[PDB]
Design a protein around this ligand. Structure first.
Ligand code: DHT
Lengths: 8, 241
């Protein structure tokens, strides 16, 4: 996950 | 007022798109710049959301999901406000280096959606929306779109959403006409967001054909989350029916 990388 | 203090303190700053305003307005260049702006803004929305009161009450999977469903409405609402404050709703102020006149509205192939966003922006003037009302409403938009089958820990979300609504009613305080109008304005974001969702999804599907660039996180979100909304598995929470 691209956005999950960013979320954490 | 601890609540307003935190809202005011966490409110993001100015985000620029990096658009080249010396080249001719083309569809490909404008939309590629809007996508890059969406990406840059998403970083800011994540940091903002996670700093909101209560937000960590949510299960971490719900925190991500609520961001991934609500970003379009949140961004569009913020852009409407900037447009109102900066240029009196005459143009769409996506960013300092990306302001849409009618010509760019037309060239973007999103003219009808841009017009709707412009109407939204005039609403902030016509209703005399205060900066604090704006801030409370924007925070509520984060908790206005969820899976029809609920969230992982849905009870904490319902309690959060209840509290944000209370805070708005509170900053409001025939005074009930006010809450009617603010709630109607919040609802009016959702159809605009839905048409943008359909537009950006179709644009992603045809992105190689039309030479529009999607950044990584935008492409993932629009291919994995946005279809859950367009297919009806995830749906806005309207005040009015
Ligand atoms: C959220 C953004 C970008 C941030 C903002 O100020 C609002 C604006 C609304 C239209 C969106 C855009 C990001 C990129 C999208 C989704 C394009 O692909 C098509 C419509 C654009």
């Amino acid at each position: 996950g691209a956005f999950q990388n960013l979320f954490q | 007022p601890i609540f307003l203090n935190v809202l005011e303190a966490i409110e993001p700053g100015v985000v620029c798109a990096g658009h080249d305003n010396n080249q001719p307005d083309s569809f490909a260049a404008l939309l590629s710049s809007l996508n890059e702006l969406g990406e840059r803004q998403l970083v800011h929305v994540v940091k903002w959301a996670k700093a909101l009161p209560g937000f960590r009450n949510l299960h971490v999977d719900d925190q991500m999901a609520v961001i991934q469903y609500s970003w379009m409405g949140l961004m569009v609402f913020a852009m409407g406000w900037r447009s109102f404050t900066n240029v009196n709703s005459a143009m769409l102020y996506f960013a300092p280096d990306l302001v849409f006149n009618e010509y760019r509205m037309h060239k973007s192939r999103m003219y009808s959606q841009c017009v709707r966003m412009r109407h939204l922006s005039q609403e902030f003037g016509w209703l005399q929306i205060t900066p604090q009302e704006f801030l409370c409403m924007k925070a509520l938009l984060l908790f206005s779109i969820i899976p029809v089958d609920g969230l992982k820990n849905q009870k904490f979300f319902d309690e959060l959403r209840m509290n944000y609504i209370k805070e708005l009613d509170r900053i409001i305080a025939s005074c009930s006409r006010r809450f009617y109008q603010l709630t109607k304005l919040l609802d009016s974001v959702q159809p605009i967001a839905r048409e943008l969702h359909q537009f950006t999804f179709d644009l992603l599907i045809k992105s190689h054909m039309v030479s529009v660039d999607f950044p990584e996180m935008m492409a993932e979100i629009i291919s994995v989350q946005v279809p859950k909304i367009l297919s009806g598995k995830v749906k806005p929470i309207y005040f009015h029916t």
